[PDB]
Design a protein around this ligand. Sequence first.
Ligand SMILES: [K+]
Ligand SMILES: [K+]
Lengths: 238, 120, 157, 246, 49, 100, 31
Amino acid sequence: GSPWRLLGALCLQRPPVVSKPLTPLQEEMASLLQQIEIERSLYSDHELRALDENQRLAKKKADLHDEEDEQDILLAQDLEDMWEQKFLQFKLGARITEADEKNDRTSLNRKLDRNLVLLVREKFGDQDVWILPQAEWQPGETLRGTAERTLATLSENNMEAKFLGNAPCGHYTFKFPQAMRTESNLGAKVFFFKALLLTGDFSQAGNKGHHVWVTKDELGDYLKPKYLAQVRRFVSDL
Amino acid sequence: VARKERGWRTVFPSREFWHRLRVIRTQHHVEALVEHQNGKVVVSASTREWAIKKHLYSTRNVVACESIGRVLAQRCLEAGINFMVYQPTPWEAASDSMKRLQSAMTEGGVVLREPQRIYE
Amino acid sequence: YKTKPTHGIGKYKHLIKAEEPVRAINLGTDYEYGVLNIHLTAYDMTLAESYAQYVHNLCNSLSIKVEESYAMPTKTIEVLQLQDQGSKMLLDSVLTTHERVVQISGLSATFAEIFLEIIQSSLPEGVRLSVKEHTEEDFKGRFKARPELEELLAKLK
Amino acid sequence: RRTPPLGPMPNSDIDLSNLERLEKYRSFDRYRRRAEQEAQAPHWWRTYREYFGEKTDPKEKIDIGLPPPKVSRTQQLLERKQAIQELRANVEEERAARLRTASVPLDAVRAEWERTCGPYHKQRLAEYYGLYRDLFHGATFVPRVPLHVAYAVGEDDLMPVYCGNEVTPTEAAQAPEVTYEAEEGSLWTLLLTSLDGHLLEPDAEYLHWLLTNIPGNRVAEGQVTCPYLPPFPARGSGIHRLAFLL
Amino acid sequence: QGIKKMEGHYVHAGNIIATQRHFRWHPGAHVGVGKNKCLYALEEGIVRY
Amino acid sequence: VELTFEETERRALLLKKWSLYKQQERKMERDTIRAMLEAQQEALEELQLESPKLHAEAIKRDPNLFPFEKEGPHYTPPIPNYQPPEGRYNDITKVYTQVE
Amino acid sequence: DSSRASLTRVHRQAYARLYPVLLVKQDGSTI
RNA sequence: CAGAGUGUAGCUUAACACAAAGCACCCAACUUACACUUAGGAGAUUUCAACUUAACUUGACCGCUCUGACCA
Ligand SMILES: [K+]
Ligand SMILES: [K+]
């Protein structure tokens, strides 16, 4: 054996649920692009229809020669009124949810436009530390297999995850305090593996206050300085 | 009556000239050179020069190229250079930058064609 | 000249790829993937083309060879809706589905995780990403169906 | 029979195993730029430059001129960067550049050019005209004192002398007006020579003007060592070079 | 076909220096090229390759 | 309709700002990829030292990685109890056949 | 970011005017 | 927290001064796209003091990169 204890950590991420809001400059550029798109476009069918009906009203008022009584029951601008009415009745889903207002950091329904990371709390030598879920490597298993095993040893979940590749995306090696530091147990060598949360969540039984879903910005509050510096390298915030 | 370096018909550019205007455009600057066929630079104007840079909003735009033409035309007349050949690529010749630089040179007095050699 | 030390100074054809006159799909090694098709399907044609362009340019920045960039045939779907207090379905809207494919090759095994993380992170709203392994069926699906060959083939059956 | 190359052969540093992954030129302009650079490098094979290039001496040209002026680059760069920011901050300057209606003041450019690169452009132009070759047997100097010479033509017009512009013998029939910047107590010597006029000896010159022990820039108070003689280029003899040396 | 004037030979203006079916030797300084790719001297002097 | 001078001026200035804003988006993306690549490669190096048998497995390709499907974000999230209207989908794509 | 390449216009020479609309899906999500 | 090395924007053994250069890079138009080309865009000497010289040399001061301490 070796002095270092091999570990496999899981970087399970919930990708954004909704699109990110446009920034002030993006809003102006989006307005100009829409303006340019209209200017360089041909008349649409709905525009040509609204034009003819305007002219028909003139031909049925000035010329007074119209030979068609029926014409069309509904006009173009009248049709737009029905469309706008239907839209106002429909109520969209909230992009800012109850969990956002209540700052419930244990739910997956918060910060829908951001990317969340799963942190669990473990006790190490009678000390409460926040870490990315991990498991100790066992013979006859790959280091990725350890990460997939970690997922299956969480507190009552039905989460389905998609692992991306076999290589680790980061590592963190620490040494135990000299009190327990030994030649055979010098320290540990964590190896993180990124995964995507397809579907699922901790059950109400499993929601008992031993995990959080946090963005990369609010990731330091829980992790330690040195552990944080190594996790903030492969956790993107694009 | 001096010999021009004729030949080189299979390569580009021609050597059959006494003086040529050569324009160098970089990512940040515009330089124009008048050089003898033997390779000696006669006169030059570059936006790297403080004398020109201090009056330019940008040293990489069409205005910069036109300014280089006007400055170079004056320096050509003071050096006695009244004729030269210009050997642009097809895309360079069509560009507005080079068209404005050429007009600046001709307005400045320089003729961008050379008189034919007298053989007899 | 052959005898002289400058022999062969004008050699150039060894510096150019051999171009001497459909395409065999290259299965990757144990450390590289084969030809990969990056499908981009969206209900909006501009979003599918804008992202297909983004993926092409991103691959060039990362030195990932882009074998081909092409559009798949558009699929039009009529959307009928049951009318209120009626049993008749009436045409509501016509929705078109536009697909764009960026075919890449030589993607490294270790680098695929990073590449996939970047292109999924930038996916616009309403655009579906599907990265598949290229197969002959995918290429053949881009060509018109031959009814005459089917009838002659049916006789053999 | 074969002979090994006498040096590194062109295109040897290209790795031919990874040809598909190597970056290509893609543009005519990028190949030409590299091609022009390769042509200028020295080679161990026979080249056009070997047979047609002027045979310059290997030893560097001796500088016989005044010392270069001492400049503080740090202070100079600060002032220059500040001036550009002020120019670019102006919104009218941005619009004139965008609408392609801006221009440079040619007179102000030349004044600054006289004080900065001007001396080195004059040295380069004098070298092209063969003045250092003929006057100092290849020794060069940077003309660091701007010399302004103008012939009075009529009563209201002047014909300036720059560095190779053509002046007719009729315009130069009388001594020119000469001015330069000089400190009090300095002494100067001005001479005019025809490099190509000599009718008998091929390597000799004619002294057209020699003023010595000039106090400051008061040329009219210098000793007339040789009185002014107008240029007399012989008919059919071509174009002559007359040089004022301060 | 081939070289008519080797390295160092003296040529008068008009002298054909080489004839060729394809461009094996290219025209340099003071060397003209005919419609049939024939290389000829434009000046009197010494041939150099 | 011809644009006013002020409009063409406002459009040109906005596009100039767009060049610099997109330059800084690309920089952030170019430095995120670099950070990820360095972290991965530095983790693989450490793994090779610790146990060359696990490193060999780590650098192999994953047979299950592809097909990899991901839908883009929505504008608004799904509504918990929303009943869509009843209807039908009728594909009307033209079928093209090659004869001759 | 979802906005990395979402600001676009129709890059065609001849095209009829198009209007922005919300497509409500069967689960209630919109695009 | 200490000990070493280290220093122009992304790269460069660019920078004699006449000058902070060349390339890489970003947007738009052309291109299915890419590429090319055109027309635009953004930039650096970590900071002071020492023939005032100095991006360059010696000092401090900052940032960086390793080696230990600390670390679950
Ligand atoms: K003479
Ligand atoms: K021939």
